[PDB]
Structure 1
Amino acid sequence: TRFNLPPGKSGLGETIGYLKPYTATTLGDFMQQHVSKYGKIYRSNLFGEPTIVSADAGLNRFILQNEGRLFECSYPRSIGGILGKWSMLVLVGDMHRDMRSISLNFLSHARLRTILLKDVERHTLFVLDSWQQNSIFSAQDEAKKFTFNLMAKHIMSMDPGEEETEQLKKEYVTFMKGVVSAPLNLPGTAYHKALQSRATILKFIERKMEERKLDIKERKTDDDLLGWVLKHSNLSTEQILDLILSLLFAGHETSSVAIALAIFFLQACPKAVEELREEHLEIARAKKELGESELNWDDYKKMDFTQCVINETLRLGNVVRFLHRKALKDVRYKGYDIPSGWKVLPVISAVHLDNSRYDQPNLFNPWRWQQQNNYMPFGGGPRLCAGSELAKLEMAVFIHHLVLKFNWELAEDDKPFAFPFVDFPNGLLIRVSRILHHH
């Protein structure tokens, strides 16, 4: 083959072993064994392609920052099949840049600080005020309701707990299993089921688009993303559809996982919950003195220990395990040959769990962040998560009201696994009890 390729078993495929589920607060047996035997940069045959796998933090940074120059986003076909050819995980170059710009304006700082913050709180309370005490229920399911409803409101003005919002959410439950499965469009497979849901979702959104276009004729309307792209962009119908469909997927499957992880880590770390309660009680009490009832951006900026808990939740729990890229030309990195056209997987989660970068890396220790290259849960470079500031705001507002209203406990054993999407197999069943006297 090539003398300076990274070592490996095989440049004979290893996809099944690579994808075998593992405990989400580790890298799993397959990755650990390959790194122990071959080193942090190794070769394999994965997803049908010769592949370089990187658990090396410096190479991962280099890959992400040289997007569009030496490396390019290159996901398996199931992603583009389900999220669409105009989604941001498929688009490259100028079209990707323009889609990203639209996304950034809509999670733009100004809109985020004002209108979005206020909806985030209202949706947090819609969920928390429905919870019954001393009754087993799935925290993972409730977190996805919160974040999906919030996105449906922001993108298409859909109201939470209305029938059409609940039915739309049910369609999204098929997506993640389809995205990670073989792209066999055959009756009964997970990919076929997600494509059927895609068809249903697309029909729903395009009907709402046609209604909104009539509304804009009769001058009734651009306060949500759908209205915005209709009036202020020249995207085509299909481009709008994939933008909306894929942002609702992000609303189902990203920050909801993070919130479920936080609820799990925190019930095993009561000292962190006590310190969160002090922080949030002080914010609430100050607001009550002023007569304020809604959070504002200045309140959010006070949530310093909450940010420590958010950073630690993302570091330990690793919502995203690795990203898909390909080499755009031959790259020779510290002696290793990365040939043109090969797949390249930056395992962004690896640096988070490296005991030479983080003391006791498998421990939930939010104080490692307090008053404090090694942290990339949102990716990096020109594809750095465009929702990251909304994701942190959702987590923080949800924790704010969670710790003020309730104590909680696990109803049974559970722990998160990576499939590679992160999921609590037993649903993170909890019970809550209402706090009647704060300290």
Structure 2
Amino acid sequence: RFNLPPGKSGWPFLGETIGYLKPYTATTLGDFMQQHVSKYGKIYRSNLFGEPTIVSADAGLNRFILQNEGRLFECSYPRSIGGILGKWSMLVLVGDMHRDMRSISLNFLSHARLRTILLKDVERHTLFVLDSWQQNSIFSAQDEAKKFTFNLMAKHIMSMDPGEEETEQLKKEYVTFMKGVVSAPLNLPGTAYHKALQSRATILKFIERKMEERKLDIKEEDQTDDDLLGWVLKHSNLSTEQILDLILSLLFAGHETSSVAIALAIFFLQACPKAVEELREEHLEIARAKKELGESELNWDDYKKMDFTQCVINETLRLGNVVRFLHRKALKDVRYKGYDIPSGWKVLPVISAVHLDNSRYDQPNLFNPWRWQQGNNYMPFGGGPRLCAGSELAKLEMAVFIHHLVLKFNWELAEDDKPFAFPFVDFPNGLLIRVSRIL
């Protein structure tokens, strides 16, 4: 194990971030962005992730970039990220195989499947986590949200059941694996990146074992495409290596961001009692109607009643900005507002910028869910051809979690030392809270 001389952790300039809100990280993104925008304006150049880079806090340019994917710009992560996610990870791929994998993901996460299958299981996994919560006892809201979102995705990707020893161990392995993307890409014994590469090998071996079992399942039930692993084996022509990277990546994407989104909602709501009251009123009415009909499990009609919840969700994503920026590269010389973006340079559209623009939002730094009672100024899931394939599941997860959360608990920050300080919220300790049962 190398004893490297001390120094700043993570990527140069930004610290431990690759563009999204990651709990438990040491990040300087907020100060970097505010200082450069103040000094150079909304479109400036720097050197980030090892390359000359144009950073865009300009809403028009960000829209222009996302809409011109494949023609003027393309998704482009640092090459070191390929070692973590794999050569066939759709999150970093462009071209025909990305198109095929996006089509798989859109089928896996379709509206039809949300209504018929995923909604029932979202509630089950929500209650599984919430029923274990104890009162008056400090814990990480982010950790608990990640338990929920990971269990849900592990169930529907590989049929793994919540709380089973193998499911908890895989989740722990993902912690080490995912830290690799925000670490300095130093492949030396003892570094977070090296450990992340080891975790990748461990996870890939686990997934391939599950794949061998599913191949037997398919053969036996011939003489089973319920989970994504079975579906891809039967309905796609992906190679083993491509199946492995796809599962690895969807399980990553399927629980990293949605857990943070739920933690952000918990954070914003504890500071806005009026919103909690209106949520409780909304979800109490939903429960009353279901009791009046003798129903016990949520259905799609219940979800459609959650009008103010959707306002809370929209406002949580607008102000919390799970995704701060995306990774692009110019395919040609591009001119915008008189500036030249050279061919081959990295381009980082800071998509959170339009969300905090006081030209687009009255009091953009204020958590005001009622603004959505009265998108082009709203892009927490991106835009253009790579728009989040799991956006509707993410909102369903937040809404169902909030539904049971506000019916069952009050909550409070571990200490009253956490005010929302523009521009970016960080969760260096995983949002510690305490709950009290409503009874």
The alignment's TM-score, normalised by the length of structure 1, stands at: 0.91
Cα displacement (A) at 1:65: 0.8
CA gap 1:421/1:171 in 2 versus in 1, 3 angstroms: farther
- Asked if the contact 2:20/2:323 (under 8 Å) is kept, the reply is no
Q: Which runs of 4+ in 1 moved over 4 A?
A: 2-27, 413-423
Query: For residues 20-49 of structure 1, what are the alpha-carbon distances to aligned partners after superposition, in whole Å with 9 as ceiling and x for unaligned?
Result: 999999972221221122111111122221
Deviation at 1:161, TM superposition (A): 0.2
The 3 A distance-change label for structure 1 pair 238 and 83 is: same
SS in 2 for 1:50: strand
Distance 1:69 1:131, change over 3 A: same
Q: Is the 8 A contact 1:71 1:328 kept in 2?
A: yes
CA distance in 1, matches of 2:7, 2:37: 10
Give the distance between the partners of 1:81 and 1:4, measured in 2 at CA. Answer: 23
The answer as to whether partners of 1:319 and 1:422 remain within 8 angstroms in 2 is no
- Name the CA shift for 1:10/1:372 in 2 (closer, same or farther; >3 Å): closer
| Counterpart in the other structure of 2:261 | 258
Residues 234/176 of structure 1: CA separation in 2 closer, same or farther (3 Å cut)? same
Do the aligned residues in 1 keep the contact of 2:24 with 2:427 (CA within 8 Å)?
no
Q: 1:236 to 1:197 in 2, by over 3 A?
A: same
Distance 1:410 1:3 in 2: 39
The more displaced of 408-417 and 253-262 is 408-417
Aligned-pair CA distance for 1:182: 2.3
SS in 1 for 2:18: helix
1:288 aligns with 2:287: no
1:275-302 deviation digits (Å, cap 9, x = unpaired):
0000001111001111111111111111
Shift of 1:361: 1.6
Residue range with higher mean Cα deviation, 188-197 or 146-155: 188-197
Structure 1 match to 2:216:
214
Aligned equivalent of 1:235, options 215, 233, 238? 238
> Cα gap change, 1:19/1:251 in structure 2, threshold over 3 Å: closer, same or farther?
closer
1:151 aligns with 2:171: no
Shift of 1:138: 1.4
| Aligned-residue offset at 1:421 | 10
* 1:351 and 2:354 are equivalent in the alignment: yes
CA pair 16-88 structure 1, distance change in 2 beyond 3 A: closer
CA distance in 1, matches of 2:24, 2:421: 6
Paired residues of 1:22 and 1:29 also in contact (CA < 8 A): no
- Following superposition, the deviation at residue 428 of structure 1 comes to 1.5
CA contact (8 A) 1:7 1:43 kept: no
Give % identity. Answer: 99
CA deviation profile, 1:36-68 (whole Å, cap 9, x unmatched) = 221111111222211111000000001001101
Per the alignment, do residues 105 and 259 of structure 1 end up closer, same or farther by CA in structure 2, a change over 3 Å counting?
A: same
Q: Which residue of 2 aligns with 1:122?
A: 124
The offset of 1:177, in angstroms, is 2.3
Please give the alpha-carbon distance, in whole angstroms, between the structure 2 residues aligned to 1:135 and 1:82: 36
Q: 1:418 aligns with which of 394, 418, 421?
A: 421
Q: Distance in 2 between matches of 1:231 and 1:372?
A: 37
- Contact kept in structure 2, 1:56 and 1:350, CA below 8 Å: yes
In the superposition, relative to structure 1, how do residues 285 and 274 fare at CA in structure 2: closer, same or farther (>3 Å)? same
2:15/2:28 contact within 8 Å kept: no
| Number of equivalent positions | 435
* CA RMSD across the alignment: 5.9
Query: Residues of 2 paired with 1:212 and 1:372: CA distance?
Result: 41
Verify the 8 A CA contact 1:133 1:432 in the aligned structure 2: yes
Equivalent position of 2:409 in the other structure: 406
d(CA) in 2 for partners of 1:64, 1:5 = 40
Tell me, yes or no, if the aligned pair for 1:155 and 1:226 is still in contact at 8 Å.
yes
Could you say which residue in structure 1 is the equivalent of 2:71?
Answer: 69
Structure 1 residue 426: Cα displacement: 2.1
Distance in 1 (alpha carbons) for counterparts of 2:230 and 2:25:
42
Q: CA deviation at 1:427?
A: 2.4
- 1:369 paired residue among 347, 372, 376: 372
Provide the C-alpha distance between the structure 1 equivalents of 2:156 and 2:91, rounded to a whole number of angstroms. 21
Give the deviation of 1:218 after TM superposition: 2.1
Q: Partners in 1 of 2:430 and 2:16 — Cα distance?
A: 29
The question of whether the paired residues in 2 share the 8 Å contact of 1:149 and 1:159 is answered with: yes
Shift of 1:77: 2.3
Q: 1:128 to 1:102 in 2, by over 3 A?
A: same
Q: Is the 8 A contact 2:208 2:244 kept in 1?
A: yes
SS of corresponding position for 1:44: strand
Which secondary structure does the structure 1 equivalent of 2:185 belong to? coil
Residues in 2 aligned to 1:140 and 1:339: alpha-carbon distance in whole angstroms: 40
Q: Compared with structure 1, are the counterparts of its residues 49 and 67 closer, same or farther at alpha carbon in structure 2 (3 Å cutoff)? A: same
**CA–CA separation in structure 2 for the residues paired with 1:28 and 1:216:** 50
Question: After superposition, what is the alpha-carbon deviation per residue over 1:249-293, rounded to whole angstroms, capped at 9, x for unaligned?
Answer: 113311100000110110110100000000001111001111111
Does the 8 Å CA contact 2:16/2:27 hold for their aligned counterparts? Answer: no
- 1:434 alignment partner in structure 2: 437
Structure 1 stretch displaced more, 289-298 or 355-364: 355-364
Contact 1:51-1:344 at 8 Å conserved across structures: yes
Please say if residues 320 and 424 of structure 2, whose CA atoms lie closer than 8 Å, have aligned partners that are also in contact: no
Does the 8 A contact of 1:329 with 1:341 survive in 2?
A: yes
Distance 1:37 1:227 in 2: 53
Q: Does the Cα contact within 8 Å between 2:23 and 2:426 map onto a contact in 1?
A: no
Q: 1:64 to 1:102 in 2, by over 3 A?
A: same
Work out the CA distance in 2 between the residues paired with 1:358 and 1:26. 26
Is the Cα–Cα contact under 8 Å of residues 59 and 351 in structure 2 kept in the other structure?
yes
Q: Which runs of 5+ in 2 are unaligned?
A: none
User: Does the 8 A contact of 1:322 with 1:346 survive in 2?
Assistant: yes
Shift of 1:89: 2.1
Q: TM-score, normalised by structure 2?
A: 0.91
* Residue pair 1:27, 1:350 contacting (<8 A) in 2 also: no
- Residues 24, 317 of structure 1: 8 Å contact kept: no
The structural deviation recorded for 1:162 is 0.4
Return the alpha-carbon distance in structure 2 between the equivalents of residues 131 and 67 of structure 1.
44
Shift of 1:129: 0.6
Between 27-36 and 223-232, report the one with greater CA deviation.
27-36
User: How far does the alpha carbon of each residue in 1:58-96 deviate from its partner, in whole angstroms, 9 at most, with x for none?
Assistant: 000010011011001001123221111111122102111
Structure 1, gaps ≥5 residues long: none
Greater CA deviation, 71-80 or 285-294? 71-80
Q: How many angstroms does 1:334 deviate by?
A: 2.2
Q: Do 2:42 and 2:58's aligned partners in 1 also have CA atoms closer than 8 Å? A: yes
CA 1:18–1:178: 2 relative to 1, 3 Å = closer
Distance 1:421 1:85, change over 3 A: farther
Structure 1 residue 3: deviation in Å? 45
Shift of the 108–314 alpha-carbon distance from structure 1 to 2, 3 Å rule, reads: same
Name whichever of 72-81 and 123-132 sits farther off: 72-81
How far off is 1:372 after superposition? Answer: 11
The SS at the match of 2:435 is: strand
CA contact (8 A) 2:18 2:181 kept: no
- Contact 1:77-1:183 at 8 Å conserved across structures: no
CA contact (8 A) 1:176 1:421 kept: no
Q: Which SS does the other structure have where 2:20 is aligned? A: helix
